[PDB]
A paper describes a structure:
Using molecular replacement based on fungal ACC CD and CT models, we obtained structures of a variant comprising CthCT and CDC1/CDC2 in two crystal forms at resolutions of 3.6 and 4.5 Å (CthCD-CTCter1/2), respectively, as well as of a CthCT linked to the entire CD at 7.2 Å resolution (CthCD-CT). Owing to the limited resolution the discussion of structures of CthCD-CT and CthΔBCCP is restricted to the analysis of domain localization. In all these crystal structures, the CT domains build a canonical head-to-tail dimer29, with active sites formed by contributions from both protomers. However, MS analysis of CthCD-CT and CthΔBCCP constructs revealed between 60 and 70% phosphorylation of Ser1170 (corresponding to SceACC Ser1157). The CDN domain positioning relative to CDL/CDC1 is highly variable with three main orientations observed in the structures of SceCD and the larger CthACC fragments: CDN tilts, resulting in a displacement of its N terminus by 23 Å (observed in both protomers of CthCD-CT and one protomer of CthΔBCCP, denoted as CthCD-CT1/2 and CthΔBCCP1, respectively). The CDC2/CT interface acts as a true hinge with observed rotation up to 16°, which results in a translocation of the distal end of CDC2 by 8 Å. The interface between CDC2 and CDL/CDC1, which is mediated by the phosphorylated regulatory loop in the SceCD structure, is less variable than the CD–CT junction, and permits only limited rotation and tilting. Analysis of the impact of phosphorylation on the interface between CDC2 and CDL/CDC1 in CthACC variant structures is precluded by the limited crystallographic resolution.
Biotin-dependent acetyl-CoA carboxylases (ACCs) are essential enzymes that catalyse the ATP-dependent carboxylation of acetyl-CoA to malonyl-CoA. Eukaryotic ACCs, instead, are multienzymes, which integrate all functional components into a single polypeptide chain of ∼2,300 amino acids2. In addition to the canonical ACC components, eukaryotic ACCs contain two non-catalytic regions, the large central domain (CD) and the BC–CT interaction domain (BT). Here we provide the structure of Saccharomyces cerevisiae (Sce) ACC CD, intermediate- and low-resolution structures of human (Hsa) ACC CD and larger fragments of fungal ACC from [name] (Cth).
Author numbering: 788 to 1032, 1036 to 1133, 1153 to 1212, 1253 to 1379, 1386 to 1464, 1469 to 2187, 2196 to 2259, 2300 to 2311
Write the structure that this text describes.
Amino acid sequence: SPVVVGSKPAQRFAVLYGTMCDILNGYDNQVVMQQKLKEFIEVLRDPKLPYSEFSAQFSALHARMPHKLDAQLTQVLERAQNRGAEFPARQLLKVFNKFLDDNVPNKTDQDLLKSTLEPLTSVLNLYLDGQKARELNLIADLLSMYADVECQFSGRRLQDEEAILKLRDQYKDNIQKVVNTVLSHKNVMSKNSLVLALLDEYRPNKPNVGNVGKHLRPVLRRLTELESRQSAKVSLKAREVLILCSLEERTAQMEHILRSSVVQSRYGETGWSHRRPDREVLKEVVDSKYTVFDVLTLFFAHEDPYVALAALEVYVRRAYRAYNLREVRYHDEERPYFIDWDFVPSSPATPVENDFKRIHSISDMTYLARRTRDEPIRKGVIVPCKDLLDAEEALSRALEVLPAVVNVAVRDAEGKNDEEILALIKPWVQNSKADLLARRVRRLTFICGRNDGSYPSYYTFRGPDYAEDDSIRHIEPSLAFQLELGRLSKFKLTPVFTQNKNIHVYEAVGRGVETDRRYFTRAVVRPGRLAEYLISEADRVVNDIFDALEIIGTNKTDLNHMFINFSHTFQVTADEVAESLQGFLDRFGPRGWRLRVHQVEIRINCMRSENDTMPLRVIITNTSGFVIQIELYEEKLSEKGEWVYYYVSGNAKIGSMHLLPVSTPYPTKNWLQPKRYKAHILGTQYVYDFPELFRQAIQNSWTEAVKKIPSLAAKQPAIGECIDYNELVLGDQDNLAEVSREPGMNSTGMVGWLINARTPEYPDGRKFIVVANDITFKIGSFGPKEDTFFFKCTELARKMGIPRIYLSANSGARLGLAEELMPHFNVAWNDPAKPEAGFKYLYLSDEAKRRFENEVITEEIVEDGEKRHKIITIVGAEEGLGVECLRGSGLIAGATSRAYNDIFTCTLVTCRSVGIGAYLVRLGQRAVQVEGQPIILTGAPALNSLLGREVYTSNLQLGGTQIMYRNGVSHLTAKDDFDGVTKIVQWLSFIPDQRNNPLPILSPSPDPWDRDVVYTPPYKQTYDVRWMIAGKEDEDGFQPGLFDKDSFVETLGGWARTVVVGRARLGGIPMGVIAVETRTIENITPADPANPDSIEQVTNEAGGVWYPNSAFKTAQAINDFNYGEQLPLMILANWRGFSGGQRDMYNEVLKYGSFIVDALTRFEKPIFIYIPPHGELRGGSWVVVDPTINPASMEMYADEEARGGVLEPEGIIPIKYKKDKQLETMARLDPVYRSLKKEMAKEGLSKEESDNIKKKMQQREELLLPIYHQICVQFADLHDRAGRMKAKGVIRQSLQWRQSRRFFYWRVRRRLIEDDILRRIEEAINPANTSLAASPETRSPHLVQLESWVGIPGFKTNDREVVEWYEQNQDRINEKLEKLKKESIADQMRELXXXXXXXXXXXX
């Protein structure tokens, strides 16, 4: 069949709209959605279509009514087709109205014409508006057609089509329409894909916010209400477009500004053309809030060569904003592009990290750190190319004006070239591999300008061969500082496609470990508005990321993060922003939770503080499945020249990440363990694992206490919350600061924590400091930073009063030499040919001398005619090589010595503790040693090398447990690192939470106070005195001691076991215990391997005697229970004197004996000396323990059946009851001896007769002598009896061992409280003993005042009655205190010529 010459595009337009009409109306016609849509857009844009639609219809209508009109219309069409392009639609309207409805007489006899020319009239009307407006007509029709059918299904509660059909019963015309609308809804899936493809095509609403945009504004707003699940996705897309409803008009705006820049008016002059572009006008574009890069890409292009220059200026000034300005030079060569700009503030600028003097690039976080004094400026070059092939000529010729950073623009938005464009830019860089290299340029960018508002694609080549870093893509090597990326350094990053060019998603996998697979998002937002704006801007950019993470998928990701940088300097403060944050996070949260996103970081600026920015970075983490991790920071520099994370958040400062650089490289997965490994090879836990060891130990302290003591158990604080620690790291002004940061990454070789542990004694909490060395951080050696640290912790624990715990694992002081001077120093020999012939000295070359000078003290002496700088002393730049470490070591040494005498001090040998470390163990006095860790002074191989022979092999052979516990350096032996902590937390249970705080007393509970002491020692043989303290575990039942069942903890019992020391509880009251071992113990000292003859020496320390080592043990213990611990004491005095044996005398027995007396005068808390049953206290022993030493705190008691005299009754008898004295008493009691005495006295008997009486008596006296001897022994023993002691007032009372417990419980408690009341009396009176009579009933002069305040008659006695009075009248004494406090104020103010000065001081 024949066809019309020009009807191809008309017929092709009428089918491509029809192939889309069938899908929207719900018919089966399914044809390729993307291709037929683009073909419809390509037939609405061609100027031939209006003519084509006319030529088809008019051909049949030529032979219609009055031809007069038919011919005149044809003339217009034919002329407009060749001459000019656009269709004369409006001319064709005018001619038809004039002839048809207007020329009623001739043209239209009757109203027939209207119907005939109707198809032509429906052509000149769709084109009257225009050709592109005809395109918009058939996109205000297909974007209304969808809404028309779908809205009813999302309509007035009708979600059912059948219910809808019954509702439709209303319209007659809807008879056919009922089914048509139902047919459409069924195939909505195909419809959604068509509308979405149409919404994406007209999405460049940003460029044209009028032609394609305003025309579509109302017919698109009728597409956001469709929230219904089916249309949900399409409604969201509609919203995107509306937000956009500028660049088309901006094309004009910027074009004008560039041209206005060129020729400055300055009316009254002929030639402004030559004048280069002016800042004032161009400034408007460069500093604008709007995106400029989005359109600018076409202006360097196809324009006047001068305008191309002006555009290049706009671009440079906008991007290199953070950078500095310096001479813009435009040269006009073959390619008029040549913009030569020169210039980085790097310290007070953008939040960056600067150490010493250094300046780095935006992308290159490592340029040249050395310094920027001997470094060039970075010469710029930006070229506008037209084609990709032609671009090469703007490279080889471009580079010639470079004696740095270079940018290259293009004009071919033809296609979205990827990989092929990368294969089209790489042949130009590999060819000029020496050309770009010679000029020393680091960065090269390639901008590709798209005309439909698509953000241009950037490709950057960096390094020596310029391998092209895939990291910087579709973004500028300037916008890059804002992208950071220097935080994902420990990750192999590879980016993935993003629909939005602002956002860049990166695949990150740990450099060491590949398991860690995370999607890190990096976005830079440019807020282009003309406080609620930024929070609404956050919703737009986070939604963009959520939709992009959707298409890439959640896949397999452990964690996901997204960074959103705000280029805006808005006036707000974080306090209100913290409330608005809460609002949108609960909505986005569930979506972010599916994508496996764990945290989000927002970096905003706040001009309102100064009217200068306060950059507030905020991290929101979804931890434990809970957020609440809303940490609001502040970008402030640490003084150290670095920008740190100073948070003033809302999660109550118990947060994470604090006072940390902005350059942290987001720690990966597993980075924690290799560190653990190096500690574990040494048999010690990694330092940061210890806080949790303590938690389990406290957890354990409760689980046992709840058993023994029920009821008082419910205050248990679960598994967690047992302890509440926070790290310690040196502050700004070297003043320790509480930080709650991630474990590991310690700044120094020492770490500390402030722990608030809820112990069962202090269930509300108790604090203490824990200091430990990182054995991984340089062998755990003691450098100056480590020393300054340790000190400031000691200082802190002291300030409070809370105990200190040191965990030792070190290698003495630090080691090093000057490494830098090793491959530079020269030698001056006696003879240069034979260097073995001795060397004169060591010198340094003049050129190598200037390199250091301050690192070496060099003297000048000319030898061989050379300027030789002989080294007279080496200094070295680095710290920790000599004396610097020793100075610090001595300081902390002193600090620990001072701390021991003030607060509770304790150390733990978790691993090898050498040199200084070893001493801090002793200065720490109270120490626990783990079975496989030595306290060594000098290295075991170092000793062998010095002696010349292999004597010692093990560091334990001289530092181990078998030495330090057996000599009293170690107080206890722990099987493992935890066992240590366990036994320590145990000591802590005996000690008050603070310094001058009441003891950790409990209810009588495991052992009641009102029980009699069952175990009584056998008088014949020896007994384990330990049984008298805690109790004797016997075959037949269990006989308890005078202290609580299972409460005793023995210490130092491996050295001088002749005295037993420990801590125990008396009816809940904890106190110090010292007792005398009765059994003959045998300590055997080991043989020294150093002297081969030295043998193991046998020493049998017979029980109940004081030896040099026993005395020292006694003395040490007294001071230990006195300083820090502050415990009451009980001494079961049972020594019968001292060993005056030569060896023991020479072994300075007397020196340590005095040390008991010294230690006793220093004590504050009450001390009880109780001689137990069978217990003895003769001569030398008594003296060093008598209450008159410290009558203020000592109290002495003796058992009813105890003994105490000047000497043993066996010793006194040959001095005061000699043989002659026994015979005078014999001739008195014995009847036989005095009868025989009557014979010799009367005489009258011969020489043989007198011999008889002599030989009769000296036989009778020989028989009576052994029993008469024992009589005097008993007689002498009656002197050393208890009754006598109470009678001469050397003891307070005679005590029955059975009811010792019962007496002391109340006497202990009575003295505890009384002592505190008296201390309080003095604190109020002045806010600043003398005889044998010094008895505790007269220990204080206030015990007279307190006596009358109480009102109890038997005050000095009836201990129980007294205690109970204080407890009741705690208010009445606080009444007396304040009375006296104001009375003492009156005395000091009255005591204050000096009156005339006071009458001047008052006037002031």
